[model samples]
Target chain A: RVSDEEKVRIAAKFITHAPPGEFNEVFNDVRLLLNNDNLLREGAAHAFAQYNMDQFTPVKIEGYDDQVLITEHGDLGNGRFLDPRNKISFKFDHLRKEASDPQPEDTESALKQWRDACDSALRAYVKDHYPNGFCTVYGKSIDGQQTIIACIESHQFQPKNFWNGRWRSEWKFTITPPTAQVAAVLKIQVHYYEDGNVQLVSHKDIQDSVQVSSDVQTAKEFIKIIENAENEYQTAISENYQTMSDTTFKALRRQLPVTRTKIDWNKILS
Target chain B: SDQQLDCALDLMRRLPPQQIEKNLSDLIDLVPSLCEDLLSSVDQPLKIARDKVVGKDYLLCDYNRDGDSYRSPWSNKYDPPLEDGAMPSARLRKLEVEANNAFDQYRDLYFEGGVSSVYLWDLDHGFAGVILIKKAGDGSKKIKGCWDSIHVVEVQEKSSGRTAHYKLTSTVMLWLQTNKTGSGTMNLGGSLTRQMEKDETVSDSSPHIANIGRLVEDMENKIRSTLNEIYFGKTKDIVNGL
Candidate 1:
């Protein structure tokens, strides 16, 4: 069994090197199989998926189930077999099960069940590993039907360090559909870094029928808006680097070049 | 004209100084009775002068053409016509009768010529006292000219329960000048003297006069001490030099 510390370190390194596509694949896989029935296979899948993207991926595998799949994907896509990063795309669709016809009560119960399950898993993980941290559960849809999300945060890294360092990790989990037939989306944003950098991740699902029937095309529009916002945020951060550096430099000293007056001798002596 | 002037001198010499003195005494006696009324009357315009004219305006009249008419060069304007009658409401004949009575009373009591009289005319709650110094001789040499002096008469309407007394005291000098030349010139000079209001009382332990006396004493002491220091050893030398 891998230590909790090792898991964290692995998650960090995985986040640092994984491409967006590979990262999304691994995140989705872990989210789908986070249940007790599939914990071992999901854990191995998570490790393998991250490992296939880069050697620096820090995720650790400790499950007996599907060790061969795990070993194959853990080689950073250099083997004769297809890289897990590429193969994971096909698996993304395969993991999505056709939802059953849902009664209103059934949908509600399923949503509550998903929320409770995600919340319980997060509470257990965070209580054991990050006792001083905060946790939250979120729903994607206005009705809170489709997907559920859980997030845990610790004041472990400084905001500046997280912004500049190789890894930008936050503790989070999500449950998407096939397990339930409700159109909902969930998002979780957390400031785990002490200096207040916000890390955000979101999950969403639609009732397949609703996605087809809706003439408003809200899901497509929403996805487009979110992508645009992400792009703008990254641009702004890059552009503000000089300003951030100057602010940090000034924060470290009592005075800077802007202060032209002489220091009072009395104050200095005191 | 010279003969008339001579006659005027003779008339002045013929007047009884003793009787004039006695009449003046009687007038003075009448003062206290009318004092409360006179003082209160005098306080009105004088206080208005001190407050509105002196306090806010700093008693300094500006020289602009559009400047305050009650001050300076504009205030130096010739008197307005009094032909509108003393009391605007009184008929011409009644005004004449009042003027005659006032002239006779003042002449019998205060002056050699009954022609020269001062009449206190109360017009529209405001009082105007006029001193008409007229000629008092033969028709050819008569000084019939009306030195109709008009002054804003102030009256204080004092009320204690159901009774009220109007005291006339000080008169503020607004505008004054003589039209006649040479000996005809009448030089009138007076100032408004006021007893400071009760609110102006300085010390609680003594009468107002006593407080004033104490202040004077303190000043006197300071002066005396200063003189003593200066003259202590030099008294003999100063006396010898004198």
Candidate 2:
């Protein structure tokens, strides 16, 4: 009974109004029973799905602006994204950044504040997993869009040149509105491969998600949508965007932990 | 029928930690008649399956008796450290209250001998959020207990009475491995006993999502059920405590 129109409406409202980091909730296994009901869970399941599709369109990751072009219809020739305007809409919808996972009830302001105080902590945390990498979470709300991200940057540890193109995965709580739950995803270039032939497992880049990737794409599209807006540095009077200030930017920079270095030419590459 | 159950629990909650205990001059006596969810008896390197893939993982007590790491986020004793760039603890808790201040903190329960746990932690009822991940660990096993952290959340009608009733949820994640480092303790009325065999890694290969899913699913059931069983039986040992 979940309609595309409602999905579109939910997402449109979310993109237009929801605060940053609201999308990063992790719904725990112990669910809510309300009105002596689990109705929220029932509605929320597709609710995230529906709202996820609000930006239901397709685009590619190329540049900050004009880089994401929504198709007259959402379709990617990529096999995983094959023949699909149906569910193949969003790409980055489910992308989780370590910097994005949060404690349940902070405001947009508090989250920024937390981001400031935890770089060293994130450094140590990320370093625990990737001895050669450093991680961060910062966002921009320039233009009409609001954004927050906890990005982890590092390389693969496979045998030399024989490695997958992606090397990161997000372990985060699925912080959709109205709730939170945790899950993981790897950032691998996935396609239909007969697993019976080569049985293996990975926890990197996590997913497209196909669904998650599609969802990531929709939100990523919003990132560009706002970018296309007054979201630029050119306006010279940025109000909507929360671009990292040079002050704290330097503060975060001072905390480079592992083999990782400054991310100037290197911000949000993956 | 239903009344009898409450009557039983009320009578039971009033009993001592042990199902039955007594001292006769220099004589001491104990009975296994109390609780069954013993810690030592738990086999580490627990086995579970995800989809078709199965592996080994173990569950340990997250029971934070000492307020050091775990405390009610709402308590005045909140001592959890602030994150590197986290918001002010004052404002954070303020907004946390602003978000959903209706629910009251429930009394945490513990069995004898530190074999304990608390739930719905990091769990939020309503609000923007709360997240604190520190970088340090005891580093006992090959790594810090990946399963050390816990999160809890609750939900209910905005108009509902605070304790009238609400939905509660709990989730804990860890790349569970056998606790080769050491084991926990269990207390029978008069005697403390060791149960489960010694510990070891459930599997030697590696950890995976399938492994974790299977492990998490398996453990969640085992853990939740154990809570039911122990709370059901041992706590009832009170009536017979006489």
Candidate 3:
């Protein structure tokens, strides 16, 4: 039986933040448990770990920091580049400007050129690698120019004993070229199951700018903007989950405060 | 016998005015001697009785050949009884006392107005009867006679219950007769005698009339008084003006 004081303490911890890195550790532990290969051990570990993580940080994202990479084998913790293992493959293509060349055109025209190049590259990549997969493009930049974006979703493989059966997943990529003196940045996001065969349900892609640049500095600047947006989205998801979970717990506590009162451990265990 | 006669008179004197008619009938039926024979000649109009006899200085006379009678030309037919004959018997006198007490108690408890009189009579060895009289509007100075009878038939356990029940039969025969002026006189002299078999019960007869009559009279009087007050400014004005 958790005393009212103890419950309040636990709830207060969830409502209030501890420190900075503590949340990251909790989130990483939850993520690892969720992605474990062993089903039962992974389920139990995730459940227990998620309780703490859910208390503070409710959202977990992969490859957000650029250190974490998605490879054919699995998620390489750090320093590992992506390697093609299965029939399905992914690659990043960049268009760079040669130094000492006079500025070809204004920043707007250069961005348009970069967008056309990205679109052609995406079409070629889909034709070669994702013959069965499909792509969708969307969004516009701030300057009223059409943005180059592609989404590839596949359903070729099926996972067993997870989510009833295996299902297909989605991956979204947006390449925005820099305008003015900005460098071009390619924003790649993968939305898939922790188990590769497990299905990906749904995904979303948002683009803010149309300009694309060939400079590394411009790309870094654009990447920062995208990262800020991703942070906001992640924060919103965490806050929403926290609110939902708290409300659910409060309702449960009001209806049945004493968890053991009506619970039969033997029945559950058996 | 004298006591019984006194008892009969006492019961008559204590009778309730509203129930006088029935009580008089019951008394006449129970004690045959108390039944007054209506003289056809004495049925003369109230005007004649008032003009000729009321103020006249009269003397007593012996009219009946068999017995001594108090009489006068005015009282030629309706004569007062002699002092000796009027004296009641011991048993009748005792019954008279009992009847007077009962009637007085009943009057104090039930009836409000002093409009009724009680009478008692020794019906037989054990039974007794009561008569209630109510005065008519005529101002003639004499006992206007009983108007009702309440025969105390039997004091016994009712067939259905163990409690002692007074099998009372009210014999008030009240009827209203309207004059040419639309003013009416309530005639309460009719008899209420009805024969019942040995197996008959008092509950067999309609007691509803007695209950309903009392209620109706009370309500009617209340409504009439209220209307009179509203219309004439005072209830007394209606009565006095009428």
Candidate 4:
């Protein structure tokens, strides 16, 4: 059995010599893939990864039962925070039964998230968009595509509505033109129940789905857009105060479940 | 009108015959430090309030030379794909020769520009801080960037089946971040746009990259200490008694 040292040797030899010989004639005599054996291949893999460990980021593939949703506006202890590298990923690995990380919530969470996300967008969108950035937090639909998803996110806290509102998943980062100014052509759905309470259902995208001029073509440009959108979705979670403090207030107001657990008070009195 | 924030790390060590290279499976299993270092080197090294750390982490290492073999720091089976259009090609970028075995290596990662920020408020004072993109001189300029190169160790053996000499060398593109910077000109990118909108008449000059100079070298100091701690930690596990 070949040793780890041999495997590393195998990987090392290939890394230096494996470049296509068409690039150089010296590669012709570089004794490529020493021992062309599996053991050698094992060593090469180690060498390959070891060398590149710095570049080795916590990574997830495109579409393999796992999804890395890089969105905008998720909240933490920090307000309206965003990061270009933050990845909100979900991977699905179902065994005999099912074990995964996913749950459905209400739209109030979505709306709060929108407000937080919009607040952040206004700050950063202007920084990046300048005269062109649409600081408006409303979504408009131009009958869909010919569409580009622009910066997408909601409040830093839960009760998120950005994902399913007027904007589709793909439309999170669509850009608006500076010349086109229709003001407020926003659309969204909200259901007001009899109790004077409302659950945000959906919204309409701003009818400005027109792809902007050729300012973004390179991958880096796309990366910028991606980063902005990610900032929007990343921090979309439950607010610290509302979830805890408000829950306490609700408990005080007797709004939470308060089933009467019959106690043996008389018996205890003895 | 632009600039770059670059941080690179290099680690090369020799694995002599005194160490048992036979139990390479142990090497494959040593992945805790991969994440451990990432945690230590994260954007927020000391962040913990309420929801600050309420997030998930990811990491995996796999190689396919035979039998659909792949391993990760986690027990779950996972396949890692090219990330963010930032995938590193398997083809070796460069190779070097020394007094011993031939040294070769592939470029693992080369990319840039990762901004981190946060905002918060309970029921009172709101606080939001953003580490914006690279900006011109002054006003809290915090440029965040990192990149790395992977290398290899080639061991030349004697006719008597013993390692005579070892050469640790290779090629790599350690690109942390790159943008245009000029000591006497208007820095490009974020700050320029910000100033442009407010003052429309900002000059767009300065075609020079910032000389991060020794600062980069200084950051390398942090890299070396952490690099060895994690790199050889596995080696220690491998050669504990061999």
Q: Tell me the tens digit of each residue's lDDT in model 4 across A1-270.
A: 545464455335433321111112112111232335554445444433332221111123343332122223211111111122222222222111112333232223332333334334444644463222222132223455222223322211112321111111223434444322221112111111111111221122222222334432321243344445433322221121122223321221121113322222222222
Report lDDT per candidate: 0.27, 0.25, 0.29, 0.23
Q: Residue-wise lDDT of candidate 1 within B110-135, one digit each (tens)?
A: 22332332233353533333223221
Instruction: Mark the regions of model 1 whose C-alpha exceeds 4 Å error after superposition.
Output: A1-219, A235-243, A254-270, B1-242
**CA shift at A30, candidate 1, in angstroms?**
26
DockQ of 1: 0.00
Candidate 2 has a DockQ of 0.02
List the DockQ of the predictions in order. Answer: 0.00, 0.02, 0.00, 0.01
Estimate the TM-score for candidate 2.
Answer: 0.17
How do the residues B131-188 of candidate 4 rate in per-residue lDDT, one tens digit apiece? 1111111222222122222112222334443222322221111111112222111110
User: Deviation in angstroms for A31 in model 3?
Assistant: 99
lDDT of 1 by residue, A111-165 (tens): 4544444444545544554324344444344444344433323322223332111
lDDT of 2 by residue, B85-173 (tens): 22225644553432222111110111001111222223243222211111122335322222212222222213332221222122322
**DockQ top scorer:** 2
Candidate 1: residue A69 lDDT (0-100): 23
What are the TM-scores, per candidate, against the unseen true structure?
Answer: 0.17, 0.17, 0.20, 0.16
Chain B of candidate 3 versus the native chain B: what TM-score?
A: 0.32
Maximum-TM-score candidate: 3
DockQ of 4: 0.01
In order of listing, the candidates' clash counts read 22, 66, 52, 69
Candidate with better DockQ, 2 vs 3: 2
Worst 10 residues of 3 chain B by lDDT: B39-48
TM-score of chain B of 4: 0.21
